[PDB]
Amino acid sequence: SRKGKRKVACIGAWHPANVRRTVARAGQLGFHRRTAQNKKIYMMGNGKTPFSTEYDLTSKTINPMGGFLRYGNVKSDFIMVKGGIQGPSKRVLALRKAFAPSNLGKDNEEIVLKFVDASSKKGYGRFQTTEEKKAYFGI
Amino acid sequence: AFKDDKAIELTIPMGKITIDVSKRWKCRIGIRRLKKFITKTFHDKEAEVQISPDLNKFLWERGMRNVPKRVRVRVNQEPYPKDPSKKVYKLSHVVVSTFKGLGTEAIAE
Amino acid sequence: GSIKTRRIKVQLVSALKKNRCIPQWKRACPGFKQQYNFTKRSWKRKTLKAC
Amino acid sequence: MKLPRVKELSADILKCGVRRIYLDTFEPSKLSAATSRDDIRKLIKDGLIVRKAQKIHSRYHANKLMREKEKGRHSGPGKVKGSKNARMPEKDKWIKRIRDLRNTLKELRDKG
RNA sequence: AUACCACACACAAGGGAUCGUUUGGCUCCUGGGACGAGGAAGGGCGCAGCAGAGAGCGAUAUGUGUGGGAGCAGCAGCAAUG
RNA sequence: GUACCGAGUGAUCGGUGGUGGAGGUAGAUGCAGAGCAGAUCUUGGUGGUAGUAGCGAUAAUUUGUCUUCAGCGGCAAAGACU
RNA sequence: GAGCCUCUAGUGGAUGUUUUACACAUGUAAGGGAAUUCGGCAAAAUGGAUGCGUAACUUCGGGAGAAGUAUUGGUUCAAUUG
RNA sequence: CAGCGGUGUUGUACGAUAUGAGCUUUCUAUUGUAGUAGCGAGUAUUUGAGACACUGGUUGUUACCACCGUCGU
Ligand SMILES: [K+]
Ligand SMILES: [K+]
Ligand SMILES: [K+]
Ligand SMILES: [K+]
Ligand SMILES: [K+]
Ligand SMILES: [K+]
Ligand SMILES: [K+]
Ligand SMILES: [K+]
Ligand SMILES: [K+]
Ligand SMILES: [K+]
Ligand SMILES: [K+]
Ligand SMILES: [K+]
Ligand SMILES: [K+]
Ligand SMILES: [K+]
Ligand SMILES: [Mg+2]
Ligand SMILES: [Mg+2]
Ligand SMILES: [Mg+2]
Ligand SMILES: [Mg+2]
Ligand SMILES: [Mg+2]
Ligand SMILES: [Mg+2]
Ligand SMILES: [Mg+2]
Ligand SMILES: [Mg+2]
Ligand SMILES: [Mg+2]
Ligand SMILES: [Mg+2]
């Protein structure tokens, strides 16, 4: 086709003699308010107290090797939640108690952790602590 | 000039300041951005920058599609002759074997 | 070009002597009313047809 | 006397291209005063106008390659693009052979 | 409508209508109806103290004779020996 | 020619103040190339669109220095191309 | 005297800004492999030289580079065109 | 901008030294002895080397305290 392929071809009929608000057009994308309902808290803790599971007997903080990419190390209290969340690193968010309780079986189940990943987020991260890196390499 | 009429000697990270610039014109736009770096380092946007021919010749050494990673330069500050309301900064090339250990120095004369 | 006939050369010689402005003294004369010589030409704008 | 013209007349005098003429920088007044070919001849004598040397194009690699090909290096099946006959012409092999053989027979007969 | 757009009036721009003027045109009438081998009509090229076009003139390119008589339009020079 | 003011149902007519610098009417009759919004009308002059659309196929350009008086103009040193 | 690279000789300006979307010249792509479309249109794949091996039909000249397969750089040697 | 810590990407720098399928027999002193070599793809050591980036860790050095306008009391 001539005059471009990445477009809506037909934007209306002859009558009514105007464009309808329901047809797609080019413009702003992203930077909108959105609310995500019923996300579940897996863990709560502090950035400088080490922790362990019943199965992983290492004792480590939440901070990965070298920190989070454009942030560094967590120092205060933290929450951990399932799945992804709006916006990039460093943006402010508002938290609210759930508006109504959920009936779904996936939501209301218990959670028991056995491992948490603490490897580097830059490149392929292949160690969980500096002790392992020092032991893999010499000296 | 500067405090106690010293020259400042510094190193310019040509590799970093040109990260976004196109391969086809790297050396042409690098010159515009070397001058910009100087003016922000001494907080003097409206001032003139003057490049000595030896420094020009060092920069163009591998043609238009390349620029050196680091370059060491001596800087002097003088009132601008054609309009002495402005300053002019004069750049001279300093030949070095290695960059390890070289910070920012101020030298008398 | 370099090769010319005698008839072509005289046409060029005459066309070259005629191509001049009004001399600067004539403008001062009481009876004289011309502004510019309308018979002046440029090689960029006209052909002689000497061929 | 504009400096572009000085270069043209110098190029004529020194029997080289305009790209090889160097004008000395410290006396532009002395250059600009020139009027004639005889002025330029003097400036040339005094060394204010100079003919530069030619740019280098060495035969180092060409010689090296040539000697290697004489030893029999390169020249394998992955280095040739023309037919056997293009590289070593067949009519020439014939013509070389039969002239030698005929010359051999001629001498043997004539010597008895 | 602070500043945009429109209209009215005063001043400045932009264009050349109108009125005043004319060493040109047109029409009718009367006279005339005169070229060339003694080289015509028509074409070209030259000629000025400063001179392109046009006018005038032919290497004698403002010469001779007759009748008159005051200047040659600019600048430099000429003129009752015209 | 331009602002105002009066007369007439109307086609039009009259006066006043500035501008202009030499010609102009009222009555009765005569002769006509005798009245314009239009013709994708004819000629000349001017808008909105608009400081907008565009002005950049090709090898490529940088630094100093003099002019220029503000020309990547000239000259030196580099980097490229046919 | 192909394309690509150099010597002799010759060469260049509408300024700054990292510059969204849609374009125009181009690159690359998991698994699938023409399901796309009037239609494999466009693109991809094959490619030089050396050897082995080559069908129907034919006017016996051709078909024929049929098809199908293998080899290829650097170094150090023998042997003399294999 | 540099040190010194930390986290990555690529794959083992330059130069030396040793080895290397093979091919070769040169020189100085001097009568006869001693001295006495060249040419070579590559491979191993020094060397998880060298290069390059980012650090909300820590030390040193260097630069920065202005100015112009509008509305109000
Ligand atoms: K001709
Ligand atoms: K012409
Ligand atoms: K043959
Ligand atoms: K009209
Ligand atoms: K009408
Ligand atoms: K040739
Ligand atoms: K060729
Ligand atoms: K198909
Ligand atoms: K079909
Ligand atoms: K098609
Ligand atoms: K047969
Ligand atoms: K076939
Ligand atoms: K090495
Ligand atoms: K190593
Ligand atoms: Mg089409
Ligand atoms: Mg990552
Ligand atoms: Mg008068
Ligand atoms: Mg009429
Ligand atoms: Mg535009
Ligand atoms: Mg090319
Ligand atoms: Mg694919
Ligand atoms: Mg695939
Ligand atoms: Mg279909
Ligand atoms: Mg096709």
Cis peptide before B79 (omega within 30 of 0): no
Distance CA A29, CA D74 (A): 62
**What torsion do the CA atoms of A34, A36, A42, A47 make, to the nearest 10 degrees?**
10
Elucidation technique:
cryo-EM
CA–centroid distance, residue A18 to ligand 12 (Å): 63
Nucleotide nearest to C34 (CA to C1'): E53
Distance B88 CA to F64 C1' (A): 15
Between vectors from CA D81 to CA D80 and to CA D82, what angle results, nearest 5°?
Answer: 105
> In angstroms, rounded to a whole number, what is the distance separating the alpha carbons of residues D49 and A54?
92
Identify the residue whose tokens are 């037919």.
D83
Query: With contact defined as beta carbons under 8 Å apart, do C33 and C48 qualify?
Result: no
F chain positions with any atom within 7 Å of a protein CB: 60-66, 74-80
What is residue A116's three-state secondary structure?
A: coil
- In the chain, the amino acid numbered C44 is K
Residue with tokens 């057009």: A25
Per-residue flag: A7 CB under 7 A of strand G: yes
Rama region for A67: left / alpha / beta (φ>0; ψ in -120 to 50; rest):
left
- Spell out residues with C-beta < 7 A from strand F: B 28, 31, 50-53, 56-57, 60-61, 63-64; D 2-4, 7, 21-23, 25, 28, 52
Question: How many angstroms is it from B34 CA to the middle of ligand 21?
Answer: 44
Query: Is residue B77 a contact partner of residue B1, using CB atoms and an 8 Å limit?
Result: yes
Q: What CA–CA distance (Å, rounded) separates B52 from B91?
A: 6
Residue A138, both tokens: 């010499």
Following CA atoms A38, A41, A46, A52 in sequence, which dihedral angle do they give, to the nearest 10 degrees?
-160
Strand E neighbours among C 13-42, CB < 7 A: 13-14, 17-26, 28-31, 34, 37, 39-40
Judge if the beta carbon of C49 is closer than 7 A to nucleic acid strand E: no
